[PDB]
């Protein structure tokens, strides 16, 4: 009697035990969902990481920049879940921006090839995954992507923020297409989460000024949040993704749910 009992859900984006997708996968399994996982490039690493999940789940390779991986994806998922079975859910928890597009590298100094790669992975791939998976999704189904509120510019995030603005726009169009299948498409805008990369950035991996700026942003976020914000805890974000994967928000689509402690609703 979990929130997601009997649901078949694809979860992309696990790389480490601190990935937001690891926690989404863990909570979905705690809630009775049967998962299919997708991983990029380091499959041996991802398998060892996913071995820590409450239940076993088939892992499929998916490089979103690879058209062959996308073209074979639905067939590979069908084989993993069994012929005649379809997905009820899809989680996009994929994001990347080359170092030139984030941090202390001046915003104007990011070459377009780098920005384009980041936009391909972080925004266009949300449409790529929906195109590949909608033909194998059941009516009442749900597609969820991870967002970081890009409504206002912020230091260091730079082109990653531009990619999120593009992602929010993509989500509204994916919802139009997904609707033809009786499927919802939404994003969860999370507050900052101390993933391995976020800790490294605050530690100065992308320059001192950028680290200092992200640390101030994190502190301000918890201060603004009426219920507080714990950057070390991805569970509230994972629960929110599961809320969207469930039958409990059936009239919400092309939309954004903020799992940010309410920080975006307050100025100070």
């Amino acid at each position: 009697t979990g929130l997601l009992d009997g649901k078949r859900i694809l979860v992309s984006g696990i790389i480490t035990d601190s990935s937001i997708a690891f926690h989404i996968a863990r909570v979905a399994q705690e809630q009775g969902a049967q998962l299919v996982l997708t991983g990029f490039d380091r499959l041996r690493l991802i398998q060892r990481i996913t071995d820590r999940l409450p239940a076993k789940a088939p892992l499929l390779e998916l490089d979103v920049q690879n058209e062959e991986h996308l073209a074979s994806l639905a067939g590979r998922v069908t084989e993993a879940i069994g012929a005649g079975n379809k997905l009820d859910g899809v989680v996009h928890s994929i994001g990347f921006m080359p170092q030139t597009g984030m941090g202390i590298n001046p915003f104007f100094d990011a070459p377009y090839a780098d920005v384009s790669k980041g936009i391909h992975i972080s925004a266009y791939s949300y449409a790529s995954m929906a195109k590949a998976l909608l033909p194998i999704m059941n009516p009442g189904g749900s597609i969820v992507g991870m967002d970081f509120d890009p409504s206002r510019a912020m230091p260091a995030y730079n082109w990653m923020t531009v990619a999120k603005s593009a992602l929010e726009s993509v989500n509204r169009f994916v919802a139009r297409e997904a609707g033809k299948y009786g499927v919802r498409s939404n994003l969860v805008a999370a507050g900052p989460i101390r993933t391995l990369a976020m800790s490294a950035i605050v530690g100065g991996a992308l320059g001192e000024e950028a680290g200092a700026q992200i640390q101030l942003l994190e502190e301000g976020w918890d201060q603004r949040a009426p219920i507080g914000w714990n950057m070390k805890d991805a569970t509230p974000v994972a629960k929110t993704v599961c809320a969207l994967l469930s039958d409990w928000l059936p009239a919400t689509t092309g939309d954004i749910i903020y799992a940010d402690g309410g920080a975006h609703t307050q100025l100070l």
Copy 2:
């Protein structure tokens, strides 16, 4: 094993079997919640209506314009739920705007006394109820109010839209106060629902032009909604309110969840 098992929830706003609050109360009970209901003025009528709910629930009188009703409310709820017990949820499903403030009566012709009454009932009362109930709410608790997207002006709704804009602002402040109790505060922005009053308006109860305009708005809403919009079905709205009353959106506060078929995310 319902979504709201063991939760004690107050639900205001039932007047007819077509009230959005009736459906919120029905779904909350189907999901294991123990309810306390509040009713305005016509208690005998409300009791006969609520007798149709899946389970028995104490009904308390609450006129939000009456300071004595508000001052005695927490004590009356405690008596109904038993000393030592507190509420986990509160539903505000209250709205009113005198006839001069809605319909064919020109927007400029609404006297302030009428607008002020409508704003008192539809917006200020969200803060009034939170003030009365927060001292008897448990941490992890949830306050939910009903909204109708007032981001853009629309024909006929007139001062009711102004009252909703004020309500959205009130919600952000209530979240600040509710946070001190470990309580969330959010609104559900519903698409148009064919309540008794909505059917009467489309039928011309507030003038021909206003009826024609609201009918066009309803049609456009379903056309824009990527998953469609059924104005005759309050169930998707009721489910969304229950999603907010549950433990599944724990990092969302001072916010608005749109249960509108995704219509507000599309232009055409």
Copy 3:
């Protein structure tokens, strides 16, 4: 050859030489506009203040809560400007919230009578003035109101923020009515301005905590603003109001122009 040469403009809201309306009136006159001023209650004081403006301007009494003042307003303006002449512009620079609705007084402790008075003056009066003045405005005309961005809740501002949210909604409806006259209606959302009342608040006139909170908000505003924000200088705000009164934004209506140093477009 001023920006507003030959335009007849009504300007309300002058009380001191630090009123935003004093600077709007000064810049409009520097730009060739012929003004009619309205004042509340302290006409002798207002006249002595307005004697400092670059040019002489008739001053009319206007209490926005007084229906007789509103009913006689168009006739009184016509007498001041001459029969056969109409206004090209109207400036609403009126705002009030009783002490219980702002500052350290808890948000929940503001009685409705106080909130309603504040909403009457700060929001409903924008519609009251447009109703009175549209019959004496020329096509191509412009109505401008003063806003303080209420999209996110903030400390101390409390019910004044709720009143601004209501004002933004009122503006969108006033635009619908004003359009029938070929008239535009818009708000200027200013950054914080050190008026006499703002200085008194920071100084602790409405409690220590509220003063400290508003001082932090002011500092954050200049820090966020990509071009900086000088709270001691109302000139950039006055220039923006004149931009809206001019023929230079002819396709903008029911809208909000932010004269806030760009602070609302940045998170940090």
Copy 4:
């Protein structure tokens, strides 16, 4: 005594006499501005078109996808305006999306190479131009870009809408950089304009369904606009761009001004 007397302004984006940039250039010249024009690929055509402007203006080649054109741009402008002189204004009126990214071609069928080209030209180039031109702009200067409101998804526009969402995000970051030079950066969100390409689209150049959908969008736009919307008249848009190029909106940056007849503020 024009609005832009003595200002040196670069205007990009003229291709035909129906280009929005042609009208921006015409109004800026009527208002006393001294222009430098940039053109893409068809310089002989652009020169013959620009010969119709009120005054002579040097024309420089600028392909925004060409790093050499961008690297030599400031030097070429300085040569055209004279050593010791700098620009007061910059107009970005550049947009492109390959046919696969707009129209009847399904949203999912646009290959990334096409989307990336469109995003390069329509969004990234706003940052490219600011990087090249800020070192030759005077304090008090203004950068203006052309936007088409992408807040909600719409039929046919597809990836062009995604590119506009990315552009709005880019604008907020450009404002941060431009602020260091005492320069403002803003976008004008225009209503639909019957350029040669728009007429061809409505005529079915990108498929019947797309043409029909854009025609419905145009009709709805004028219906919603409280002051109406004339798609055959770029003058109100050109005037708005000049308002931003002037000294009259000195505290507005990282922002969006809507020259859309107020259509985006109304639902119906």
